[PDB]
Design a protein around this nucleic acid. Structure first.
Ligand code: FES
Ligand SMILES: [K+]
Ligand SMILES: [K+]
Ligand SMILES: [K+]
Ligand SMILES: [K+]
Ligand SMILES: [K+]
Ligand SMILES: [Mg+2]
Ligand SMILES: [Mg+2]
Ligand SMILES: [Mg+2]
Ligand SMILES: [Mg+2]
Ligand SMILES: [Mg+2]
Ligand SMILES: [Mg+2]
Ligand SMILES: [Mg+2]
Ligand SMILES: [Mg+2]
Ligand SMILES: [Mg+2]
Ligand SMILES: [Mg+2]
Ligand SMILES: [Mg+2]
Ligand SMILES: [Mg+2]
Ligand SMILES: [Mg+2]
Ligand SMILES: [Mg+2]
Lengths: 170, 113, 126, 216, 50
RNA sequence: AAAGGUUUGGUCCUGGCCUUAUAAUUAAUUAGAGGUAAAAUUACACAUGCAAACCUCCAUAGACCGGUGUAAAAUCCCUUAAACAUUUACUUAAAAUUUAAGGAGAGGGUAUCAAGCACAUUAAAAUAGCUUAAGACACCUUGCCUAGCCACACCCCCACGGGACUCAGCAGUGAUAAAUAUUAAGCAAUAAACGAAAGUUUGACUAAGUUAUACCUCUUAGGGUUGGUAAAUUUCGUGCCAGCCACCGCGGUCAUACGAU
RNA sequence: AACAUAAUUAAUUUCUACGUUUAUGGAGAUAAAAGCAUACUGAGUGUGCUUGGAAU
């Protein structure tokens, strides 16, 4: 049995379910939440369930969490311009908190698809090379082309050993 | 007005020391994923910051701004803001003094003092 | 290696096996090894006729135009490929070599006619 | 890290070696001395190419000509036998400054400056002359300057524009039709912006390298 | 678009602040009533204790 | 791992070792040829030959290719700035390639290495600070980041200088080691250098030679094993002897376990 | 240690010479009522403690 409570939180599939990818402006997200209370329950679940997913998609963002420092839970984002975005998450479900932060400071689906396509621009199916980078190492693999001499011996007339002998004979 | 090279243009941390002149030692923490366990833990870093007015006290949360030119070998940041003063927190949501999970001044009242 | 000096070049990198050559058209710093570190792959050249009797050249004409616009030199074999394709004019030595081959076959034909004439003299002798 | 430590000997060696180069710079009389029996430079042992042998024995160096003239021939015109043979149009240098090698026992090695007139076309500024140590120079007589420098330019007949390569022309016409531009104009390359100088055109001597002072 | 989202954010914060004052107002009324009753018991017990 | 064998009088638990799969090297026995890939005891010492030229003199190149894993926890990824021993265009802007200063994070061992001893800040030059059990410092070992990258180039970390005075270029030799490729052919192809160019040069490379080290296509048959794990022993000899075992074990005269068959 | 010459085309020389590590009695094969801690002597006994002894 995997240790801890809700061990599914420690699986790559769960971490990859996060949908909040912050804009490049976002630099820090401080989380102020209370460990005891009734109006801060959604905030506690957000730290428990969602903060791992947010960090997984935003490795360069500093997430620092503070406990029992204020009467109410809130989120404060620090942007690169110097702006500070305060969010109030009291009486808000963890799902509501995730959707709110996605709207205000989350990249849209269109933007992300463009980056994924751009990332693969230099991979070409026609390119030949190692399996790590390319589909086919050599043109011998293609159908109709001359096969590799190791797999199929070349005709005698196409071999340097044979051609050299004829030149001596001439 | 080119910005710093350092990645940490903005860092939040706690003032863990203030014994150097006009400098505050700040401990920041980030979350790092353990590859074997797939769990996040706290990796903490120490940042020297220029406290021009010596207005920092141990235990207070602060925001640091990366300096354009390193002031010294270790001082590459300045004190942008004191997010929370030690024991003197002011609730961002309501704006009233608080002492833990309680209001020193009720939000219903309007003291304006 | 940490090269000092040199320029980008578009050249042919030899691949394949013994008696089975295959080329990768690549853009690479000139001081790098022939089959080593390159910058971008710009196509491939298969110099052996296939089942259909066709030697197959692949040219990434968008990236080739990009790297020629940035100072990339060209190797002499690659200039010959670009000339045969029609993307560049035919190389001066492609034209000169074809003229030399025409002059060399003209002599051979004349010699064969002279030999046949000499053989005709043998026929006259009987 | 912090276990990487200074290399004082390496720093000392680099600086020390530099000083020797500055003080022990060789001179034109020594770098470009020649042994005419073997046609080999004694300083480095470099043997001249075969195609230069006739001229090394049959032609003069520039400062051999200028050392015999008052003021080292400032204002005089000098041409090269290689140009005389290659180009019908006048090619010459108009000398403006001349710094001989005083160490040379005949003042036959040095540097020169002048204004170039190549194939009848004259440059506007003076620059240093290259290949001053070559056996190729011929001083022009004063009485022959007017006839030597007389040139009338012919109308230029080299094409200014040419067709595009066959494939590259088809790609241009295809893009026109795709973009809606309907025309039967033939794409043309413009050659005026990129016209090549002759291969024997004088090069920039100021940016040229000089041989080292280590004898072989 | 950034400015619009930052304006919507402040509105959401004010809308929730209004609810907070409404909720805390109701508590003040209820807690005040309880405090008066508790003070009455102290008065009765304090007099008896004296 | 889909597991198996093995503590005991017996059962169960715990717990190690071993077996069955895969590969590399060396060795014993054995073997025809052909195609292909690879080639590898040693940073020990080296006879001999070759590996860098080009070219109307100037320059350019010999700073690459090639080789080895010396040193160093040395690195990875990323940021910033500037260049180049450069290219191509403009007489000024796109690249390739480097250098320097840095840091989100990641990065071998020993804690019987627990303290390091100037490792800090301020900028009137004062303050007494800086790193460290969230692993400093010390010591030890190690090429890693693998379209490739880093480090080294007889030794002295370097190389003014000194000295044990040069093959860790190809091919060879001695010594050493369980470890064993040709002192070979050609610049025809591609790559590099040089030249305006026809061209020239290259132990890079190409085409060969050698070798069951690997795969493919054929064709001869050899090697081992035969108590259990774990597929398979029939007669004799030996008799706790000679021998055999990866583990458990076998042999003291009816040996399925040793030797021959 | 690091000056000066020159200058009616422009150049010249200077731009030095300590300490620290490695190395040359003990424990293991072939068989040719009890205990823990501790003290004394020799396992004997002393003091405390445990039941993993026993006692209707
Ligand atoms: S791998 Fe393609 S010819 Fe061998
Ligand atoms: K077991
Ligand atoms: K063997
Ligand atoms: K070294
Ligand atoms: K060649
Ligand atoms: K057999
Ligand atoms: Mg020339
Ligand atoms: Mg063998
Ligand atoms: Mg190399
Ligand atoms: Mg080593
Ligand atoms: Mg050696
Ligand atoms: Mg050295
Ligand atoms: Mg060798
Ligand atoms: Mg060598
Ligand atoms: Mg071997
Ligand atoms: Mg040869
Ligand atoms: Mg050229
Ligand atoms: Mg028997
Ligand atoms: Mg037997
Ligand atoms: Mg007790």
């Amino acid at each position: 049995p995997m240790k801890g409570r809700f061990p599914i939180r420690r699986t790559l599939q769960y971490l990859g379910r996060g949908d909040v990818v912050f804009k490049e402006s976002v630099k820090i997200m401080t989380v102020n939440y209370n460990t005891y209370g009734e109006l801060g329950e959604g905030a506690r679940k957000f730290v428990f369930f969602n903060i791992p997913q947010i960090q997984y998609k935003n490795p360069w963002v500093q997430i620092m969490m503070f406990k029992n420092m204020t009467p109410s839970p809130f989120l404060r984002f620090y942007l690169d311009s110097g702006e500070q975005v305060l969010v109030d998450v009291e009486t808000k479900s963890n799902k509501e908190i995730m959707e709110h932060i996605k709207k205000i400071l989350g990249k849209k689906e269109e933007t992300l698809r463009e980056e994924e396509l751009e990332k693969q621009q230099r991979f070409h199916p026609g390119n030949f090379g190692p399996r790590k980078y390319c589909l086919r190492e050599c043109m011998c693999e293609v159908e109709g082309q001359v096969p590799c001499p190791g797999l199929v011996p070349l005709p005698k007339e196409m071999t340097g050993k044979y051609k050299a002998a004829l030149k001596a004979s001439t | 007005i080119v910005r710093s090279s350092v990645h940490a243009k903005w860092v939040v941390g706690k003032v863990i020391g203030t014994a150097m002149i006009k400098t505050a030692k700040v401990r920041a923490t980030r979350l790092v994923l353990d590859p074997y366990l797939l769990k996040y833990f706290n990796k903490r870093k120490t940042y020297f910051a220029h406290d021009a007015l010596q207005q920092c006290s141990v235990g207070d949360i602060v925001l640091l701004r990366a300096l354009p030119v390193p002031r010294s070998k270790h001082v590459k940041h300045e004190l942008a803001e004191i997010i929370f003063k030690v024991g003197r927190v002011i609730d961002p949501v309501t704006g009233k003094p608080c002492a833990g999970t309680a209001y020193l001044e009720s939000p219903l009242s309007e003291p304006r003092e | 290696k940490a090269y000092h000096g040199g320029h980008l070049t578009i050249r042919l990198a030899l691949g394949g096996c013994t008696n089975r050559p295959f080329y990768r058209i690549v853009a690479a710093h000139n001081k790098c090894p022939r089959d080593g570190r390159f910058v971008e792959q710009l196509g491939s050249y298969d110099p052996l006729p296939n089942s259909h009797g066709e030697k197959l050249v692949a040219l990434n004409l968008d990236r080739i135009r990009h790297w020629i616009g940035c100072g990339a030199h060209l190797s002499k074999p690659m200039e010959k490929l670009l000339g045969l394709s029609g993307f560049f004019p035919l190389h001066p030595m492609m034209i000169t070599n074809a003229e030399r081959l025409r002059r060399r076959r003209a002599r051979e034909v004349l010699l064969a006619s002279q030999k046949a004439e000499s053989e005709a003299k043998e026929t006259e002798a009987s | 890290r912090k276990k990487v430590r200074p290399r004082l000997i390496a720093e000392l060696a680099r600086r020390v070696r530099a000083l020797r180069e500055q003080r022990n710079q060789p001179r034109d009389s020594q770098l470009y001395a020649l042994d005419y029996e073997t046609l080999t430079r004694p300083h480095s042992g470099r043997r001249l190419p075969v195609r230069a042998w006739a001229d090394v024995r049959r032609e003069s160096r520039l400062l051999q000509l200028l050392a015999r003239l008052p003021l080292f021939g400032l204002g005089r015109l000098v041409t090269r036998k290689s140009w005389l043979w290659q180009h019908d149009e006048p090619c010459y240098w108009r000398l403006t400054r001349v710094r001989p090698d005083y160490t040379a026992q005949n003042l036959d090695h040095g540097r020169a400056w002048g204004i170039l007139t190549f194939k009848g076309k004259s440059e506007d500024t003076a620059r240093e002359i290259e290949q001053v140590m070559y056996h190729d120079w011929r001083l022009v007589p004063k009485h022959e300057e007017e006839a030597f420098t007389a040139f009338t330019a012919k109308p230029e007949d080299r094409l200014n524009s040419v067709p595009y390569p066959p494939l590259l022309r088809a790609m241009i016409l295809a893009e026109r039709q795709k973009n809606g531009d309907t025309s039967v104009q033939e794409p043309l390359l413009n050659l005026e912006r990129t016209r090549m100088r002759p291969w024997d055109y004088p090069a920039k001597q100021e940016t040229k390298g000089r041989a080292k002072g280590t004898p072989v | 678009e950034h400015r619009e989202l930052m304006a919507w954010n402040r509105d959401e914060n004010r809308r929730m602040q209004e609810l907070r004052i409404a909720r805390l107002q109701l508590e003040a009324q209820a807690q005040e009533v309880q405090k008066a009753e508790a003070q009455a018991q102290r008065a009765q017990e304090e007099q008896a204790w004296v």
